[PDB]
Structures are given as C-alpha cells and as structure tokens.
Design a protein around this ligand. Structure first.
Ligand code: SEV
Ligand code: SEV
Lengths: 545, 545
C-alpha cells in the first residue's frame, strides 16, 4: 500500500498505471494523471527551472531524491550540463556551509575520536552489503577555503550521487562518510547549532590513527568497495595517497582525477593545434603540487600514446611559480616537486630578467598557456596576442577555480585570437559567436573519469589502484573523442553521453588491471568488445523496471 | 538501525542519547552532539527564521515534518503566533497554488468520478484504524479566489496538522482528503503539469452523488471520525451542512468555527466596553450569509449566557448590504437570510437617506462596528470618531480577509480613539504604543474552536454535531478568558495556551453531548473536573516518550 510509495528506490509516483494502482491498493493515494518517466522529468525540470537561486533548485532536487530515486537520476541525466553546478561544485559547498539540514535524511556515516576502536561495529551496524563506492572527506577542503568540519558529509553525499548518475553504480551500494577530526572554522566552534566535534583539527598522529582504523575497518566490512578521498586539504591529501595507495583500493579524485581529465583534453588540443607534442612550448602558470601533478600526467599520457621519450616531453614545460620562470640557474633552493620541470637551458642572467608573465611569454614564445595559478586574470590580451605570433592555434586552458580566479574567460580568449584559441576550463561557459562562427570551450569536468574508475574497480576488484589504471582512464577518455567531435572543436566526448563514457573507461581500467593480474573478479570477459557489453549491462539505469 | 531514524513518528535525531545510540545500533548515523527537544526546537527555529520569504520557511518546516514529527509539532507550539501564517492561511494557499510538489510525500486521499463506486475500497486500502478527524475540500475556496482543484489537498494537509498541534489529535489518526470534481482554474485546465481531473467542475447532481458516496463510505470505514468540510465555495458550503448535519458527524469550520470564535470575543468586548448587550447598537457592515451567520451566533451566545430574550438581542443589530441599511420599508425583496435582521423601526423616507456608511453611522449612532465587508477600509477616521460620541469604548472588529480587504487597521482604530477602541481581527498585528500605553488587538483565530470540537467528538463519539455543541464551544472559549486576561484587554485566552483551551472546549462539548444523550463512548467521566483531567491525558503531546 502506502509502503511501496514510501520506499524511494521502488516508488514511481504518477508512473504507476491505473491497473497497477488497483493491484497495489494505491488507487486514491495519487492524483489521477498517469505519466511516463519522460513526462515526470519534464515536470520536475519545469518545477526546478522556475526557482531563481541555485540553493532553492538544489533543495527541490533533494526532495525528489527523497521520494523517487529513479526520477531524480533520470532528471539529472536529461539535463546534466545544467544540473551539475546545482548538485555539486559550487552549490553543494554553500548547502553544506549554511543548509546542512538538507543532508540529515541521507545515509551518511559519521566517525570521530569518541568512537575510537568501534569503527568496524559502526560499519557492520550500517547494514549495507557488497558496497562498491565509499566517498570520505574530513571537511578540511582542497582549495583550503571554508573548512566545513562535520558539514563536509554533504560533499560525500554529493560525490556518491555523481557515481550513480555518471557510471550507474547502484544507489544502494554507495556510502558517504565524514571523518570528523575537528574544525578550524571559528564561526562553527562558537556556533550553538554546530553538531560536530567542537575542537581544533587533531594533530597528524591522532589524524592517521583514526584514518588508519577507518581504512582497515572498511577493508574488512566493505571488502568490495573503492575508497575515494574527497576535499582533503594539501597538508594531508598527497601524504594520505603515499600511505594507502598500495595497501587499499583507494584514490583521490582532486589529485588523480583532475590530471587524468586535463591530460586527455590537452592531447586533443594538441591534435587540433597543428603543433605536435615535441613542438609545443607550454607555460604552466602556477607550480603547486597539483599543477606539477597535471604537467606530469600530460607527459605520462603523451609517452603512453605516442612513445616519445618522457625526458623530451618534460622539456616542453616551462613552470612559473610566484618568483617567475623555474630554472636551475635562478639561485633559490627549489621544492622537490619543482626540480623535475626546472629549465636547464636558461642562464642565471636571463632567469633574473624572467619574473613577470609578460616577459616570460616574450622570451619562451609558448604555443600553450596552462592556467593553474588561481590569482586572477594573468592571461592578458597582449599575452594572448604574443602566443598568436608562435602558433595559428594557441592552446589556452584557464583551469583555476572558482571562475573569478581563472586566468582568462573563454570569450576574451576567442575574441583576442579571432576564434583561433583552443580553450578548456573546469566551469561550463556559454558559446561565443565571432563573425557568424560559433565557439564553446571544452569543460574538463572530473565527472569524465572518477565514475568509470569507480565502476571499473567495482567489477574488477583490484588489490589496489596503481597509477597505471588512472593513465589507462586518461587515454580511454582521450580516445573516445571521435573524429566528428574533433572536427567540431570538442576536446572530450559530450558530457550527456556520460554512461557510454563511463562504460568505456571502466572496460579499459578492467583490462589494465587484468593485464597487471591485480583483478580478483574472475567472472569478467578478458576481451574488450565482450567486456564493454558486460559492463554496460552491470550498470544501474534510471528507468522503472 | 537506520529503520528507527526513517520512521518520522519515533525518530528523535540528535535527542537519542549516546547510550541509546549504542543499544539501537545508530552510533555513526548522527553527528555526535546530543540535544534535548528544547535545544532541537531552538535550532529548527533558528534555521526557519533565517529564510526571508514565507514559502521558504514553509518548505523548511515541511522537511522537519517529513523526518521528525515530534520536533515539528514541538517547534510549532513554542512559536505558534509566528508559525500560524506560515503553516496555514495565507502561505498554505500559495504553496498549493505554485508548490503543490511539497504535498506529494504526505498521506493525502484522492477521490474523483473515475473511482465512482470504489470510495469504500480506497478508504479500506488506506489502512488507517480508529481515524478521529478527516478534513475534506474540493479546492473551490470559501473566498471564491484561486480555485486550486486537486492542489486543494495542501489545504486538507495543513488543516489536519492544526488539529494535531491545537488539540493533540494523534498524527496517525488524521486523514486529509481531496474530492476532485474538476476545476474552473483556466491556467490549470491548460497546464501540462496539472495532475487533477482536467475538466470544468461537475454539476450539482454529480457533485452530490460523489459527496454522498464519500460521506457513506467514511461512516462505514472511518466510523469514529469527525468529517470537517474546509474551503468549499458559497454555492455548496451551506447546502452541504443542511444535507449532512443530522445523518453524519460533520461540521464546517469556515461557517460554524468562525461564528463561535467571533461571538466569544465579541461578548468579552461587551464586558470591557461599559455598554451591556441590550445597550449595544451594532453595525454589521456586510450582509452575506456568513456575516448574518456571525450576527446570529452572537445573539445565540448572549441568550445562552445571559438569558436575555433572543428577539431583543436581534434588535441591537443594524445590517448594511451593498444598498445601505437593511430595513422592511426600503422597498426591495430581501434575501431570506436578511429578513431576520431587517430594521422594523425605520420609515421608508429615512431608509432612502441611509445608503452610505457615514450617514448610516450618523443616524444609528452605533456602539460597535463589525467589519465583514471585504471591500476595503470603510471604517474612516470620521466614522470611528462618530462612534467615540456614543460610547467611551468603541468595539471595532475589522474581520474581512485578507488584511488588504479589512475595514480598518488596529493602529488607526487605536490612534483615532486615543486607545479607547476594543479591537479584534482574523490576522495577527503588532502592538501599538500611544503615550507610553501599549495596545494589541485580539486575534479571533479559528484555531480557538475546531481543534477542541475535533477532540471532543473524537472522545464523545456523538451521532452528530448539532448547533448546541458549537454554541457550548463558543461559551467555553468566552469563559476561559480570565479576569487577568480581561484586565490586560485580551478578548481570548492566549493562543500559546491552545492545549489547555482545547482540553476545556472538548470537555464542555462532551458534557453538552452527554446532556443531549447523543454520545456513544460510555467510558468517559460525566462530571467536569474528572472529564477535563481525562481529556488532558488522552491528548497526544509533542515530547519524546
Ligand atoms: C517534491 O518531490 C517530488 C517527488 C516526486 C515527484 N513526482 S512523482 O513521483 O511522479 C509524484 C507526483 C505526484 C504525487 C506523488 N506522490 C507520491 O509519490 C506519494 C508518496 C507517498 F509516500 C504517499 C503518497 F500518497 C504519494 C508523486 C515530484 C516532486
Ligand atoms: C531538514 O529537516 C530537519 C530534520 C530534523 C532536524 N533535527 S534532528 O531530527 O535532531 C537531526 C539533526 C541532525 C541529523 C539528523 N538525522 C536524522 O534524523 C537521520 C535520519 C535518517 F533517516 C538517517 C540518518 F542518518 C539520520 C537529525 C532538523 C531539520
């Protein structure tokens, strides 16, 4: 009766036919209109699209997710490019920050020092079987802005939901986790309505004692699961991966997902440019560990796909930090992560005259500007025009988040080059029309890779996730950009086709794992065509069945 | 486990102690703060009060009601005067009109011609036992504005919730009903997202065939229930009561509740005025059936409480319609409902000179202005000053809904009389300060009577609800205004004390039913002190138990 309607996994609302309503004794529990899923999606979309503020839209979608899980995921997939900034970055962050009450109904798991030694019992008592995907955060944030502490559960809830939408992970087999080790958000510490551990973030030693117990408890109770780290601060995110990458099935989408996605898009940017990889001169504006991680992912992918010597791919890279061009002759002690991309072919005297971007671009004569600075619009009209002198097709990638940090707008880049610029960003931007010719930047969204990595590790059951599976996923994404997409200036397959992309990415990840003999699921086909067809069938679909 | 948390009736959220969380295996399903109900109410109130627009506030409260029923009702009762315009008139009407998706989760029952002959099976299949209160509407509306058709279920949901909050009807024993007989809302008829019967309202004959089947099906399957008609248009609301009042346990709160509440307040206005009931000269501005219903309720209560001859109470009333003073000598055929209050002591020639309110007030010299016009601010400064000439304490009641229709603001009435005016309205208004002296109008809210009528009929099980029980409830409400309240200028007990008011009103209704020997529940005490104590114990309480 009203039990079927109150289970969000099997509830169909108005899609129950008259004759079904009769058999199920729910005649009189619904208005009399009968709708198809398509009609219900158009109705939900209409409801959503009339709300004016993102957080209003998010709140409406949360109520649909609460009542009718199928209709929620069906709505997301029919309008994915539009719904992505509502259901995740950056609306999700505002929702956590100020509307954390929207997450109370959802299936969160909470850990803290008060449950030390009980992490396994908490996981057992959760009563979830054959869990495939666990997103964990501590709410510290990657961009080191707005520590959310316990409210970070909204980030895990949002990320888990993107595995279901993106790769058809079954929504009963995802678990969002908050590991609450305190917060340095001073408003929260004095806020009467903060529900987390009201204390400063624990020191490293107690932090790793709790996270170790979590990783070991998850491996015993959720043995089939992938553990994905989300939105951990820079002080911990890299060290977490060095500590766990080999003993557990885990990855970090911020670090590994981002580089895999940017690399796939950058190589397609190379294909459209005229200028082949060994002919590229690439300014990397910004030299944090993440920016150097992306450069290395690009080198590693170009080596995989084209067997150029990797040393030679590295020499295409000119790294800029806060001081200027990174060189061996400029006279400072370089961070370990910067030595690898330091120029060896630049005198001390030239180094001293290479400090502002304008003069770095004038000397290096780059073919590509990679924006990973997050210090505002450093790619000026004159800097872009200078790149026009060195290539017919400047590759300009303003990837710094959020959009106000970005090095340049797609619109300015397209304008300043008269449509010649090849552009990718993190954020969706509308098309620019230049003399009747339309241009639209490619969105290097992390949704392209983590879902397929998740679905691939769910099926394959690898003992771990070494860099080789992330590289395979990077190449798989590059190779799904068709000749037709490339012809239309797209650097990625279309976002709307995420199920197909995720099936392909998973297939490739599985074959890499099989090849490395780290797979534990022997039921799988070991040839691509059969595997791809099997993977597509294993995927949960947002349709009534 | 997560089953206890997902039942909104027993879920306590953060009020589960640590040791309870352990025993119930929900450690790790909640943030670690433990709160008392009081703390949870202050937190929910804080969340609600930061939203800027009523419909936002309503949407937040709907999510609390969905998760934690106890915390919802606890929040309402701690802030009742503030929450009433959010959870019912007028926010509820806007929610139905444009946000009907907020009602989809709730326990609505839907009837229409397509289920003709199945009304009983629909009620049986609903699987509700010993139902006490059924609110039914057809969405036509009493104020004949914004026909909502099927979306009228939000009105029944809102009204049912006020019986739980107001009188402690158990939330599992209330059933909201929409009888969908079509809609004349032309936007809805052309709206693709309207989910109701897409047709003009049925004719009277098919209307009564469906409503008859509903009344008979309810009497068999919900035998213990009161049936309360809500928000039916004037073409049907009176005729429904004439058709059903004797054969079923039913009332209409718009008609009967309104008059019971206004009468109780008006008599207390008389007590504070100096001018006793036979000395009152009362202008009834507006002469619709509802306005004449209120005048007759006032007469009937004054007769009950003071045994003045009812003919003599009627002669205190000067009825104004669209033409002017209603008299026997003015030369039109008077509607039946107007004959009773027609002046017999006014010549044809005077009648002809008594058409505008200003000159009606100049001739009649009234002590009281009852505003039931709904045609704007007819009680001018000069009209109010004129009443100052005939009494030290003008009784001025602007009761016309919504507040923009009202005959005068409490502020103007208080200003114009220098604090002498005794004021009641339908809507809450803030206090006015006049030379260091504070005044606040009395709110004649229907919440004062229908809950207690509901709780009284739930316990008593009367064969029907004759006018005598409504009169008893009217007197009971008058008599609960204490000497201390009267001393402070209050015409009603305080709204905050609704549980006590509802216990008292129910007790009196039960004794009236026992006295008439129409009660079917023989388990009840038959003396007031014991009955009142029993009634108070039978009431559902918003506390964790
Ligand atoms: C605000 O979030 C939502 C959720 C769902 C929908 N679409 S729908 O699923 O087609 C739909 C439409 C109309 C009524 C119902 N009712 C129930 O699903 C229902 C559930 C119950 F538990 C009890 C009941 F009486 C009705 C469902 C739109 C917005
Ligand atoms: C938006 O609506 C609401 C509802 C409740 C509250 N207050 S509360 O009840 O104290 C509360 C506080 C924090 C977390 C939870 N979680 C669950 O109640 C819960 C329910 C589940 F079904 C599963 C779960 F993990 C947690 C409950 C405030 C606003």
């Amino acid at each position: 009766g009203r039990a079927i309607l109150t289970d969000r996994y099997i509830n169909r609302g108005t899609a129950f036919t008259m004759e079904e309503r009769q058999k199920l004794h729910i005649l009189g529990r619904l208005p009399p209109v009968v709708e198809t899923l398509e009609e219900q999606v158009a109705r939900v979309y209409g409801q959503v699209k009339k709300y004016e503020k993102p957080i209003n839209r998010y709140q409406h979608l949360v109520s649909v997710h609460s009542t009718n899980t199928t209709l929620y995921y069906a709505t997301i997939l029919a309008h994915l490019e539009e719904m992505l900034p509502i259901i995740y970055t950056p609306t999700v962050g505002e929702a956590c920050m100020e509307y954390s009450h929207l997450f109370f109904r959802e299936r969160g798991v909470y850990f803290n020092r008060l449950y030390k030694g009980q992490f396994r019992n908490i996981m057992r008592d959760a009563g979830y079987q054959k869990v495939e995907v666990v997103v964990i955060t501590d709410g510290s944030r990657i961009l080191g802005l707005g520590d959310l502490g316990s409210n970070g559960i909204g980030i895990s809830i949002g990320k888990c939901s993107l595995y279901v939408a993106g790769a058809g992970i079954d929504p009963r087999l995802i678990v969002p986790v908050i590991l609450d080790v305190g917060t340095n958000n001073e408003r929260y510490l004095q806020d009467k309505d903060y529900l987390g551990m009201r204390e400063k973030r624990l020191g490293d030693e107690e932090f790793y004692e709790l996270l170790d117990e979590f990783m070991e408890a998850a491996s015993a109770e959720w043995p089939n699961a992938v553990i994905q780290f989300e939105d951990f601060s820079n002080n911990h995110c890299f060290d977490i991966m060095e500590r766990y990458q080999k003993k557990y099935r885990c990855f970090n989408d911020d670090i590994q997902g981002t580089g895999a996605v940017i690399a796939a898009g950058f190589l397609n940017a190379i294909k459209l440019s005229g200028v082949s990889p060994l002919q590229q001169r690439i300014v990397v504006f910004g030299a944090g560990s993440a920016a150097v991680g992306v450069a290395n992912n690009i080198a590693a992918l170009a080596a995989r796909m084209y067997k150029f010597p990797v040393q030679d791919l590295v020499k295409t890279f000119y790294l800029v930090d806060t001081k200027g061009l990174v060189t061996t002759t400029r006279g400072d002690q370089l961070a370990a992560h910067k030595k690898l991309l330091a120029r060896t072919d630049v005198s001390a005297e030239d180094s001293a005259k290479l400090r502002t971007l304008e003069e770095i671009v004038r000397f290096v004569k780059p073919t590509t500007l990679l924006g990973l600075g997050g210090v505002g619009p450093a790619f000026t009209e004159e800097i872009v025009k200078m790149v026009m002198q060195n290539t017919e097709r400047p590759i300009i990638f303003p990837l710094s988040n959020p959009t106000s940090k970005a090095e340049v707008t797609p619109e300015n880049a397209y304008k300043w080059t008269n449509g010649a610029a090849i552009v990718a960003s993190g954020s969706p931007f509308p098309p620019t029309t230049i003399g009747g010719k339309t241009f639209k930047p490619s969105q290097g969204n992390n949704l392209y890779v983590f879902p397929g990595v998740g679905l691939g590790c769910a099926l394959a059951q690898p003992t771990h996730i070494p860099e080789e599976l992330l590289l395979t996923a990077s190449e798989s994404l590059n190779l799904l950009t068709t000749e037709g997409d490339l012809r239309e200036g797209r650097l990625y397959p279309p976002l709307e086709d995420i199920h197909n992309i995720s099936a392909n990415v998973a297939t490739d990840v599985i074959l890499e794992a099989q090849r490395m003999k780290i797979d534990n699921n022997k039921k799988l086909p070991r040839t691509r065509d059969e595997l791809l067809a099997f993977v597509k069938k294993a995927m949960w679909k947002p349709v009534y069945s």
